[PDB]
Symmetry: D2
Subunit: 426 residues, 4 copies
């Protein structure tokens, strides 16, 4: 256990009294609303979201990076930190690896994971940056690059990612590339998309039978004029063209300003192409901020769609949920903890929606009562459920409070190399 | 002739000398660039864009409407004004009608059209507002309304539009609806879309063998939380679902801030679902401003995709071009004239692009020269080409100046009584 | 009373038991947090927001208007409807009038208001539309129109609004105009602004000593290329130039996409030019939707700034709040009721913020705990406080439920003739 | 001469015949329009825009940086490359330095500058990133940081920039910081701004009386929730508060989506607080693309306000123009060359506007003819005037073509060490 159990038990006992009062109070309120609190907690305890290995290290912008103390040295240091997140929140049992950053002996990776009690989520290929010794540069693209040898190198890399993932227990490959252009005329939109499609097809053929291929759309950055996989429409065309094992990934901060993201989710669900999510929040662009920290209601509405589907028996439906954030000004572990918590919060509130009541108001065109039906669920403070879920599953009532109480950060800082501030770079 | 021929002739003669000089200079410049100006002018004089019947009258906002003098009394007056735009620019031989605003005896509409030298483009249905006598209101939707009878009523209306279009020479029906929600929860996104798809499938059944059905997407307005046909992604699903006769219409001002609109155009083309365009310009939302008055380069970039399709040899590519604007602070006829000119302007510039050179720069990833190749065409002032194209086809060298010299606005002002209630 | 008192009492009693339990529970939770629920309820009871006379009628878009039954026609019907909102919520004791729409004999308006238990907030002028018989059209502008006589007419109109206001108990004139351009070159940005500043100076001269002159900025619509008073920067320049009686009004949905609105509010408070706040919500443009129906956290963050200003006792801080919304597909009365409720909800949550702890986290640069400190307040379901506040002040535990139980809408529908 | 004179003369003679024809044709057309092309050329030849020392090297995003060949090894190499831009375009005689990136013996800097025929524009401070060995980190701010010692350190750095600038002939200091927050509550908006103003007042106190102090606003990035100097409104408050020597700098890509930037320019001019511009283009956020590459008309409209200011008779109006761009997928020298050309292009077109005609249409509310009056100027292809201006002042008829014929990039590539692609960073 990365965090001493006596500290966890101690920090829980310290808050047990208040929790009992709040939980029983909320329990009575829900009962008056015809809702059994135990049924919600039982579901919340089972809700999981994968954490990004690259998320436990401090992030940065193109202007600078200000690392904290005890920055993780490599994937192994990172897994150790992800263990902390899972132990205290019990909501992040799986970690998502990124190659070549997390390149390591598949036997040692699987070894540490099992030891730390962590599983592995979808693999992540990297063809948006160049690595040492690389034969062809991805400066002008990768899977859609005009140079055939460059596309081939990109395809081979993605295939290597699948191999690594097969050796650690992953069951999916997520493909996000920066491919696009910064100038009108630089790229022929159609030709570039045709090339992307052809290369992706080669990756699909190399997909195991129980694997999923997720394509992630993004409006801009690193490309500032056009991006091959710029939105969900193009992403749908990709998934539909490649095959049934290919689905679409929806990263929250990857859409144009004012976009109705929850609608996109419902559409991809309708046509069976919602591969999963990349949770995070933002206000301006692809800010990659802590989930729910900026627009908590938006996060809830997205979950309202997921729960609605989760309700009206969409037999073939189990999207891969993942946190895709960058932490530039906070302890990465604390943010990921609260982000995972915020995600379960929105999930829990969505479960509180009186579906039958909502359907009625929708059918009646009672817009006011329909929206109020959602607000009644969203306004509910489900913190007692989240805390109780963690408590009875081996986690902490107040994850961050316990994290700080353990003094874990100062601990790893004394074990790891000191860091130095520098220029841009995530 | 809405505008006296002697007026046009006189106004053209007045500007003949300057036109000769500019055209010959541009012609020599183009020749040095390996381009035949006559070939460009020949293609430009054949580029047509449909004029909206509803654009000839002054528009407004939810805050107010400030009509001008001589506002069109009805559809026949509107056709009379459209004839002015076509006579002077020769770029708008076809009019787009809207039902029920333009409802009238089809034979009469057809006869006035032929008399004025005007044809008819795609019909436009209207279930975003209530007409008198409707059994059901479209307040909460139309084709996707929760009430079965309301949807049936909307379908029948669209079918009537097809019947009217069949009698006047139209070959398509454009469907833009306001259906959506203003509050989270008000609508079930998926169920509302399912109802719409079923309704559109019924309308699809009433399509003649040679007709097209265009669905127009829009991010917001009148709905301010969610819209059923909110973007091109949903629009593609619609066309793909309905069949080969159904395509998507792209209206420039209907996209989220910063959207790359020309890419959407390219994507729809690649999958054979670009039905047509609704030209206009904007800066904030669906402003419906004169085409190219705000972002002329963007308009060029859209046409660059259109011309590239032809270059790539896309088969059966025949998108329907239409102007969809509202003129709140100018003479509608003058705005539509210059808007039509701007569209031909961007088209001509797109034709000037050295695509052999461009393909080379794209292949080699020479981003700077690639973009400069597009700019060399865009920076070219093709006004002399548009003017000559008008001169040789019976139009005016300077359309707005000729319109003003004719005194048309004052004439119709004295002929048409202004609304009093 | 627009709504029978027996109805209010009956609908309160059937909800009294449940409220008791929730209020007690929340009271206990807050006590464990060092907060006295009673104190919070007391402040919520005193938080008021003006309702716009034009908000009780059904709104519409440039594409269509779909009126509901019992549509109020004229200021008298509207005042009758506004009275319901106030009786049930007790958070909207004042109504904002718009001239010429609400033009009526001052004495009659004042008496009608007093009889309904309603007061009058800021007056609103209208030079973004043409009234019949008007000598000069506002098609190309009003206060900043290139024609001198057109500007004088707009000025005279605003002065008249002040006169009407003085007679009914108003203490401010809000000025929002459509003035702008739809095409580059159509207007000379600087000259148009100079003209606006000069005309506003004339209006300022007619202000009593205790009156305020509010200027409202808007990015676009009706102008689609440029707007004279386009943002808070221009707005501040106006307030500063005009004088101490002139301040800026911030309307939520009048900003560019992604703008940090709460910051603009803080900036204006710091320089003493925050005249008022126009509440509503939006997602795309100036949608004028029900406050907090789309982004409730944003509403709370705006109030966080308002509550902080009070706490630290900022001078010149005394904003005039108003709801500026339009209801196109709901019962206007029900939306205004729930919007007023949401505004009080955000206010209450802001009041729960632990300022001492927050300040500590800000000084130590502990961003995570700082935001969590705001969230602990925001996540608190303060509905029990809002309901008890209403119950204690003659309102309804559940405003909408009581409104519907009363059958008020069917009643006015029977008294008012719809078009068809 | 970085570029051999014989190369310049050869590439000019090669295109001299065509230019003579295009220039004479344009001259006749303008003459018919009552405009003397000579008067336009004369003004264009004197229009200058400073080049950023940091724009000579290849830029990057937080995702990666793909360096080209012959990357400059330091400020001296950068100055050498800037000299190429000036020699070929003749529109960028001045270079804007950035400290500490360009820290070096100011005496030597001045020596190289004079030798290359370059001057120095405004100095640019850097408290948006930590330099090696830095005492206090700017992770949580600089001039507005809650820590007094951190603010003092930032002030001192700015004063240091002033001393360097005084030594090389600079007459201004531009201040752009990343100060802001990534989470609601993290910062107290007003207190942070008060700290900023006090710190800036200190810098202002140390400002020479023949110098100007420019503050640059930006909506977001690096801060993704709030930014202290977020817009022109806050910027005006700053300039007004500090004093007559303090003005506002407008960077095109630093505004919210759909913002009417040309109006901001007019407002600042009317109130005498427009210190200057930072030219570049964008489509999504602060893209930092080649000026006019995305929205050429907007660029013209900005220059329309500038030229109108002169037409209106505004006195003492001499804004400092500077290119603030990053080049991630092109030869930085070629991009700066064409960007400088595009800025002169827009300026030339603005000069063509018939002011008397425009004024009449504005007074009469003839919107259509007013906008058509701007378009008549904008649609005019002024390339001949730009090319002839260059040819007459020692430049190249076709800058980029001459640059490529010279083989300069290949040359410096052989003189400088090879680069390695890696993570993000500007
Ligand atoms: C590191 C990871 O590949 C990255 O976050 C992508 O998934 C996408 O979000 C980039 O904008
Ligand atoms: C009148 C016409 O149906 C309408 O303009 C639609 O085409 C769409 O543009 C609406 O915003
Ligand atoms: C009717 C009222 O004047 C109006 O709402 C203005 O205040 C402004 O919000 C408009 O966008
Ligand atoms: C390096 C230079 O200071 C920088 O570009 C700033 O001016 C600002 O534009 C960044 O967003
Ligand atoms: Mn992602
Ligand atoms: Mn991302
Ligand atoms: Mn349209
Ligand atoms: Mn439209
Ligand atoms: Mn308002
Ligand atoms: Mn408004
Ligand atoms: Mn800048
Ligand atoms: Mn910048």
């Amino acid at each position: 256990f990365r965090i001493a159990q006596d500290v966890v038990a101690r920090e829980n006992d310290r808050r047990a009294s208040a929790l009992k009062e709040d939980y029983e109070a909320l329990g009575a309120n829900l009962a008056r609303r015809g809702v059994d609190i135990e049924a919600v907690t039982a579901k919340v305890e089972k809700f999981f979201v994968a954490v990004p290995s690259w998320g436990v290290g401090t992030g940065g912008t193109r202007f600078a990076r200000f690392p904290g103390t005890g920055e993780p040295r490599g994937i192994f240091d990172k897994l150790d930190d992800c263990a902390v997140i899972q132990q205290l929140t019990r909501a992040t049992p799986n970690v998502s690896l990124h190659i070549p950053w997390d390149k390591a002996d598949p036997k040692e990776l699987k070894a540490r994971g099992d030891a730390l009690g962590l599983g592995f989520d979808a693999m992540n290929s990297n063809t948006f940056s160049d690595a040492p010794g690389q034969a062809h540069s991805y400066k002008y693209g990768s899977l859609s690059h005009t140079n055939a040898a460059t596309r081939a190198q990109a395809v081979e890399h993605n295939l290597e990612c699948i191999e690594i993932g097969k050796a650690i227990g992953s069951k999916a490959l997520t493909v996000w590339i920066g491919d696009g252009s910064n100038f009108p005329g630089q790229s022929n939109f159609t030709r570039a998309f045709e090339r992307y499609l052809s290369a992706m097809a080669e990756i699909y053929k190399g997909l195991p039978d129980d694997w999923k291929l997720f394509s992630e759309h993004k409006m801009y950055e690193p490309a500032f004029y056009s991006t091959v996989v710029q939105d969900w429409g193009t992403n749908y065309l990709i998934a539909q063209t490649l095959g049934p094992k290919a689905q679409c990934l929806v990263d929250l901060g990857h859409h144009a300003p004012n976009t109705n993201i929850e609608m996109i989710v419902a559409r991809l669900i309708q046509f069976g192409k919602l591969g999963g999510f990349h949770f995070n929040d933002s206000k301006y662009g692809d800010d990659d901020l802590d989930a729910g920290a900026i627009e908590p209601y938006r996060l809830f509405l997205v979950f309202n769609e997921l729960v609605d589907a989760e309700a009206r028996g969409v037999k073939g439906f189990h999207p891969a949920h993942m946190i895709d954030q960058k932490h530039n000004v906070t302890d990465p572990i604390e943010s990921l903890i609260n982000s995972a918590n915020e995600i379960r919060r929105a999930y829990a509130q969505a479960l509180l929606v009186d579906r039958a009541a909502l359907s009625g108001y929708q059918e009646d065109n009672d817009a006011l009562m329909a929206t109020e039906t959602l607000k009644r669920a969203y306004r509910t403070d489900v913190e007692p459920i989240l805390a109780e879920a963690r408590r009875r599953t081996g986690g902490a009532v107040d994850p961050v409070a316990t994290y700080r109480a353990s003094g874990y950060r100062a601990r790893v800082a004394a074990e790891r190399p000191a860091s130095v501030a520098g220029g841009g770079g995530i």
